Protein backbone atom coordinates (compact mmCIF):
# COMPACT_ATOMS: atom_id res chain seq x y z
CA UNK A 1 0.00 0.00 0.00
CA UNK A 2 1.07 3.65 -0.52
CA UNK A 3 3.17 4.99 2.36
CA UNK A 4 1.44 8.07 3.79
CA UNK A 5 4.87 9.19 5.05
CA UNK A 6 5.89 9.89 1.45
CA UNK A 7 2.99 12.25 0.70
CA UNK A 8 3.74 15.99 0.41
CA UNK A 9 2.61 18.11 3.40
CA UNK A 10 -1.00 19.26 3.19
CA UNK A 11 -2.01 22.69 4.53
CA UNK A 12 -5.70 22.31 3.80
CA UNK A 13 -8.49 24.89 3.21
CA UNK A 14 -8.79 26.35 6.73
CA UNK A 15 -6.91 29.53 7.56
CA UNK A 16 -5.10 28.90 10.84
CA UNK A 17 -1.28 29.00 10.96
CA UNK A 18 -0.54 25.91 13.05
CA UNK A 19 2.99 24.54 12.97
CA UNK A 20 3.07 20.80 12.38
CA UNK A 21 5.67 18.23 11.36
CA UNK A 22 5.81 16.10 8.23
CA UNK A 23 8.33 13.48 7.16
CA UNK A 24 10.41 14.80 4.25
CA UNK A 25 11.62 11.63 2.51
CA UNK A 26 13.96 13.59 0.21
CA UNK A 27 15.80 15.13 3.16
CA UNK A 28 15.36 12.10 5.41
CA UNK A 29 14.00 14.09 8.35
CA UNK A 30 10.88 15.43 10.02
CA UNK A 31 10.36 19.05 8.99
CA UNK A 32 7.94 21.82 9.98
CA UNK A 33 5.10 23.16 7.80
CA UNK A 34 1.95 25.25 8.10
CA UNK A 35 -1.30 23.37 8.73
CA UNK A 36 -4.54 25.29 8.19
CA UNK A 37 -6.49 23.49 10.90
CA UNK A 38 -8.75 21.06 9.03
CA UNK A 39 -8.70 17.98 6.78
CA UNK A 40 -5.24 16.94 7.94
CA UNK A 41 -3.62 14.09 6.04
CA UNK A 42 -1.59 11.50 7.97
CA UNK A 43 1.88 12.97 7.30
CA UNK A 44 1.03 15.68 9.83
CA UNK A 45 2.35 15.43 13.39
CA UNK A 46 2.15 17.56 16.52
CA UNK A 47 5.79 16.92 17.43
CA UNK A 48 9.08 15.82 15.89
CA UNK A 49 8.96 12.78 18.19
CA UNK A 50 5.54 11.66 16.91
CA UNK A 51 6.78 12.16 13.35
CA UNK A 52 9.97 10.13 13.84
CA UNK A 53 8.13 7.34 15.66
CA UNK A 54 5.61 7.00 12.83
CA UNK A 55 7.64 7.81 9.72
CA UNK A 56 11.29 7.42 10.70
CA UNK A 57 13.12 5.39 8.08
CA UNK A 58 10.48 5.81 5.37
CA UNK B 1 -4.34 39.17 4.65
CA UNK B 2 -3.42 39.27 0.95
CA UNK B 3 -3.69 42.58 -0.92
CA UNK B 4 -4.50 44.61 2.18
CA UNK B 5 -2.86 47.51 4.00
CA UNK B 6 -1.24 48.27 7.35
CA UNK B 7 -4.14 49.06 9.70
CA UNK B 8 -2.13 51.30 12.00
CA UNK B 9 -1.29 50.62 15.65
CA UNK B 10 -4.41 49.67 17.62
CA UNK B 11 -6.86 50.92 14.96
CA UNK B 12 -8.77 47.62 15.27
CA UNK B 13 -9.08 47.46 19.12
CA UNK B 14 -11.26 44.32 19.11
CA UNK B 15 -8.73 42.24 17.17
CA UNK B 16 -6.87 39.72 19.29
CA UNK B 17 -4.18 37.14 18.60
CA UNK B 18 -4.47 33.55 19.81
CA UNK B 19 -1.02 32.38 20.92
CA UNK B 20 0.16 28.86 21.78
CA UNK B 21 3.89 29.52 21.73
CA UNK B 22 3.36 31.53 18.54
CA UNK B 23 0.49 33.26 16.71
CA UNK B 24 -1.82 30.69 15.12
CA UNK B 25 -5.26 32.36 14.85
CA UNK B 26 -7.11 35.62 15.36
CA UNK B 27 -10.22 36.45 17.36
CA UNK B 28 -12.65 39.24 18.24
CA UNK B 29 -13.24 40.65 21.73
CA UNK B 30 -17.00 40.92 22.38
CA UNK B 31 -16.79 41.89 26.08
CA UNK B 32 -14.11 42.16 28.79
CA UNK B 33 -14.10 38.39 29.40
CA UNK B 34 -15.06 36.86 26.06
CA UNK B 35 -13.58 36.36 22.60
CA UNK B 36 -15.20 34.96 19.45
CA UNK B 37 -13.00 32.84 17.17
CA UNK B 38 -13.27 29.81 14.87
CA UNK B 39 -13.91 26.28 16.11
CA UNK B 40 -10.96 25.00 14.09
CA UNK B 41 -8.81 27.39 16.15
CA UNK B 42 -9.31 25.24 19.25
CA UNK B 43 -5.85 24.40 20.56
CA UNK B 44 -4.30 23.51 23.92
CA UNK B 45 -2.79 26.23 26.10
CA UNK B 46 -4.31 29.26 24.39
CA UNK B 47 -3.16 32.70 25.50
CA UNK B 48 -5.15 35.65 24.18
CA UNK B 49 -3.07 38.66 23.21
CA UNK B 50 -4.90 41.98 23.24
CA UNK B 51 -3.70 45.48 22.34
CA UNK B 52 -1.28 44.04 19.78
CA UNK B 53 0.12 45.66 16.65
CA UNK B 54 3.61 44.23 16.11
CA UNK B 55 3.10 40.64 17.36
CA UNK B 56 6.85 40.02 17.50
CA UNK B 57 7.73 42.97 19.75
CA UNK B 58 6.53 44.25 23.15
CA UNK B 59 5.29 47.76 22.38
CA UNK B 60 3.65 48.65 25.70
CA UNK B 61 -0.09 48.32 25.12
CA UNK B 62 -0.35 44.53 25.32
CA UNK B 63 -2.45 42.41 27.64
CA UNK B 64 -1.65 38.69 27.67
CA UNK B 65 -4.50 36.71 29.24
CA UNK B 66 -4.85 32.93 29.25
CA UNK B 67 -8.03 31.22 28.08
CA UNK B 68 -9.97 29.82 31.04
CA UNK B 69 -12.58 28.17 28.80
CA UNK B 70 -12.93 27.30 25.09
CA UNK B 71 -16.46 26.38 23.99
CA UNK B 72 -16.73 25.04 20.46
CA UNK B 73 -20.22 25.15 18.94
CA UNK B 74 -22.02 21.88 19.84
CA UNK B 75 -22.89 21.33 16.17
CA UNK B 76 -19.41 22.02 14.80
CA UNK B 77 -18.49 19.59 12.02
CA UNK B 78 -14.72 19.29 11.50
CA UNK B 79 -15.23 17.73 8.05
CA UNK B 80 -17.56 20.31 6.46
CA UNK B 81 -16.58 23.20 8.77
CA UNK B 82 -20.26 23.91 9.44
CA UNK B 83 -20.82 25.92 12.66
CA UNK B 84 -17.18 27.06 12.71
CA UNK B 85 -17.48 29.22 15.83
CA UNK B 86 -15.85 29.09 19.26
CA UNK B 87 -16.17 31.20 22.40
CA UNK B 88 -13.11 31.77 24.58
CA UNK B 89 -13.38 33.04 28.15
CA UNK B 90 -10.47 35.10 29.49
CA UNK B 91 -9.04 33.87 32.83
CA UNK B 92 -9.16 37.47 34.06
CA UNK B 93 -11.17 40.37 32.64
CA UNK B 94 -9.34 42.48 30.08
CA UNK B 95 -8.83 46.17 30.79
CA UNK B 96 -10.83 48.15 28.27
CA UNK B 97 -10.08 51.82 27.79
CA UNK B 98 -9.09 53.17 23.14
CA UNK B 99 -6.62 50.38 22.30
CA UNK B 100 -8.56 47.41 23.70
CA UNK B 101 -12.30 47.45 23.02
CA UNK B 102 -15.17 45.12 22.25
CA UNK B 103 -17.01 44.87 18.94
CA UNK B 104 -20.82 44.77 18.88
CA UNK B 105 -22.69 41.66 17.72
CA UNK B 106 -25.10 42.07 14.77
CA UNK B 107 -28.83 42.72 15.14
CA UNK B 108 -29.44 41.43 11.60
CA UNK B 109 -27.48 39.79 8.77
CA UNK B 110 -25.53 41.94 6.30
CA UNK B 111 -26.68 42.18 2.69
CA UNK B 112 -24.60 41.30 -0.37
CA UNK B 113 -22.44 44.23 -1.44
CA UNK B 114 -22.00 45.59 2.09
CA UNK B 115 -18.37 46.72 2.49
CA UNK B 116 -16.61 45.27 5.52
CA UNK B 117 -13.24 45.31 7.29
CA UNK B 118 -11.26 42.07 7.49
CA UNK B 119 -8.07 41.96 9.56
CA UNK B 120 -5.32 39.68 10.80
CA UNK B 121 -1.65 38.69 11.00
CA UNK B 122 -1.97 35.98 8.35
CA UNK B 123 0.03 35.32 5.17
CA UNK B 124 0.20 38.35 2.86
CA UNK B 125 1.06 36.30 -0.24
CA UNK B 126 -1.29 34.35 -2.52
CA UNK B 127 1.65 32.30 -3.79
CA UNK B 128 4.46 31.82 -1.32
CA UNK B 129 4.90 32.87 2.29
CA UNK B 130 5.25 36.21 4.06
CA UNK B 131 3.92 36.82 7.56
CA UNK B 132 3.67 40.45 8.77
CA UNK B 133 4.86 41.94 12.05
CA UNK B 134 1.97 44.42 12.23
CA UNK B 135 -1.79 44.03 11.80
CA UNK B 136 -3.07 44.01 8.20
CA UNK B 137 -6.47 45.26 7.05
CA UNK B 138 -8.67 44.66 4.00
CA UNK B 139 -11.90 46.27 2.78
CA UNK B 140 -14.06 43.66 1.04
CA UNK B 141 -17.75 43.18 0.16
CA UNK B 142 -20.15 40.50 1.31
CA UNK B 143 -20.95 38.29 -1.69
CA UNK B 144 -24.26 36.69 -2.65
CA UNK B 145 -25.11 33.18 -1.48
CA UNK B 146 -25.59 32.22 -5.15
CA UNK B 147 -22.09 33.36 -6.15
CA UNK B 148 -20.63 31.68 -3.05
CA UNK B 149 -22.29 28.36 -3.90
CA UNK B 150 -21.19 28.62 -7.54
CA UNK B 151 -17.60 29.16 -6.38
CA UNK B 152 -17.75 26.21 -3.96
CA UNK B 153 -20.34 23.65 -5.21
CA UNK B 154 -21.83 21.55 -2.42
CA UNK B 155 -19.65 23.14 0.28
CA UNK B 156 -21.54 26.26 1.38
CA UNK B 157 -24.00 25.83 4.27
CA UNK B 158 -26.56 28.33 5.61
CA UNK B 159 -23.96 29.25 8.25
CA UNK B 160 -21.30 30.40 5.80
CA UNK B 161 -20.90 33.39 3.51
CA UNK B 162 -18.35 34.51 0.95
CA UNK B 163 -16.61 37.89 0.91
CA UNK B 164 -13.96 39.39 -1.33
CA UNK B 165 -13.22 39.93 -5.01
CA UNK B 166 -13.72 37.30 -7.70
CA UNK B 167 -10.84 38.62 -9.82
CA UNK B 168 -8.46 37.59 -7.05
CA UNK B 169 -5.67 39.44 -5.27
CA UNK B 170 -7.48 40.39 -2.04
CA UNK B 171 -8.37 37.82 0.63
CA UNK B 172 -7.79 36.46 4.13
CA UNK B 173 -5.19 33.68 4.41
CA UNK B 174 -3.43 31.22 6.76
CA UNK B 175 -3.02 32.85 10.15
CA UNK B 176 -6.17 34.97 9.79
CA UNK B 177 -8.63 32.24 10.89
CA UNK B 178 -10.87 33.17 13.78
CA UNK B 179 -10.39 36.85 13.01
CA UNK B 180 -13.10 39.49 12.33
CA UNK B 181 -15.16 40.65 9.37
CA UNK B 182 -16.78 43.86 10.62
CA UNK B 183 -19.49 45.65 8.66
CA UNK B 184 -20.94 48.95 9.86
CA UNK B 185 -19.53 48.41 13.35
CA UNK B 186 -20.94 44.89 13.74
CA UNK B 187 -19.15 41.53 13.81
CA UNK B 188 -20.69 39.71 10.83
CA UNK B 189 -18.04 37.10 10.14
CA UNK B 190 -15.23 34.89 11.37
CA UNK B 191 -12.36 34.01 9.02
CA UNK B 192 -12.88 30.33 8.21
CA UNK B 193 -11.65 28.76 4.95
CA UNK B 194 -11.24 28.94 1.19
CA UNK B 195 -9.50 27.41 -1.83
CA UNK B 196 -6.04 28.83 -1.28
CA UNK B 197 -5.87 32.60 -0.84
CA UNK B 198 -6.79 35.44 -3.20
CA UNK B 199 -7.27 33.05 -6.12
CA UNK B 200 -9.54 34.05 -9.01
CA UNK B 201 -13.13 32.80 -8.60
CA UNK B 202 -12.31 31.59 -5.08
CA UNK B 203 -13.37 34.23 -2.50
CA UNK B 204 -12.84 33.66 1.22
CA UNK B 205 -15.51 31.78 3.19
CA UNK B 206 -16.60 33.05 6.61
CA UNK B 207 -18.78 31.91 9.51
CA UNK B 208 -22.12 33.77 9.50
CA UNK B 209 -22.14 35.37 12.98
CA UNK B 210 -25.67 36.76 12.58
CA UNK B 211 -26.99 33.17 12.86
CA UNK B 212 -25.47 32.67 16.32
CA UNK B 213 -26.25 35.82 18.30
CA UNK B 214 -28.73 34.14 20.69
CA UNK B 215 -26.41 31.16 21.20
CA UNK B 216 -23.44 33.47 21.84
CA UNK B 217 -25.29 35.55 24.46
CA UNK B 218 -26.74 32.53 26.26
CA UNK B 219 -23.50 30.54 26.17
CA UNK B 220 -21.42 33.40 27.59
CA UNK B 221 -24.04 33.99 30.27
CA UNK B 222 -24.02 30.32 31.30
CA UNK B 223 -20.24 30.06 31.73
CA1 LIG C 1 11.72 21.93 8.71
CA1 LIG D 1 3.45 43.46 20.52
NA1 LIG E 1 3.76 49.16 15.51
UniProtKB/Swiss-Prot annotation, chain A:
Subcellular location: Secreted
Site annotation Reactive bond for trypsin: residues: 15-16
GO cellular component terms given for this protein: extracellular space; serine protease inhibitor complex
Record keyword Secreted present: yes
GO terms, molecular function: calcium ion binding; molecular function inhibitor activity; potassium channel inhibitor activity; protease binding; serine-type endopeptidase inhibitor activity; sulfate binding; zymogen binding
Coiled-coil intervals: none
Main location: secreted
Domain of life assignment: Eukaryota
Domain BPTI/Kunitz inhibitor per the UniProt entry, residue ranges: 5-55
The keyword Disulfide bond belongs to this UniProt entry's keyword annotation: yes
Alphabetic keyword roster: Disulfide bond, Pharmaceutical, Protease inhibitor, Secreted, Serine protease inhibitor, Signal
Gene Ontology terms describing biological process: negative regulation of platelet aggregation; negative regulation of serine-type endopeptidase activity; negative regulation of thrombin-activated receptor signaling pathway; trypsinogen activation
Cysteines joined through disulfide linkages: 5-55, 14-38, 30-51
Function: Inhibits trypsin, kallikrein, chymotrypsin, and plasmin.
Name of the protein described by the UniProt record: Pancreatic trypsin inhibitor
Origin species: Bos taurus (Bovine)
Lineage of producing organism: Eukaryota, Metazoa, Chordata, Craniata, Vertebrata
From Swiss-Prot, chain B:
Encoding gene, per UniProt annotation: PRSS1
GO MF terms, alphabetically ordered: endopeptidase activity; metal ion binding; serine-type endopeptidase activity; serpin family protein binding
Annotated GO biological process: digestion; proteolysis
Compartments where found: Secreted, Extracellular space
Residues spanning the membrane: none
Family membership noted in the UniProt record: Belongs to the peptidase S1 family.
Tissue: Synthesized in the acinar cells of the pancreas.
Catalytic residues (UniProt): 40, 84, 177
Major enzyme class: hydrolase
Protein's UniProt name: Serine protease 1
Location of the Peptidase S1 domain: 1-221
Pfam families, A to Z: Trypsin (PF00089)
Cofactor note as given: Binds 1 Ca(2+) ion per subunit.
Binding site for Ca(2+): 52, 54, 57, 62
Source taxonomy: Eukaryota, Metazoa, Chordata, Craniata, Vertebrata
Quaternary structure annotation from Swiss-Prot or TrEMBL: Interacts with SERPINA1.
Residues that coordinate or bind substrate: 171-172, 174-175, 177
Amino acid sequence: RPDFCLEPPYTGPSKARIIRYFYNAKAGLCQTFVYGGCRAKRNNFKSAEDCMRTCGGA
Amino acid sequence: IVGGYTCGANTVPYQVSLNSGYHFCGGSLINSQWVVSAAHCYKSGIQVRLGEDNINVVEGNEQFISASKSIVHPSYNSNTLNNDIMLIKLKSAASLXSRVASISLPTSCASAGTQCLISGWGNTKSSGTSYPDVLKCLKAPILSDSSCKSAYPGQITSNMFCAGYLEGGKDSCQGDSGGPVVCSGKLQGIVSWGSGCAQKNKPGVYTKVCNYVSWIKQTIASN
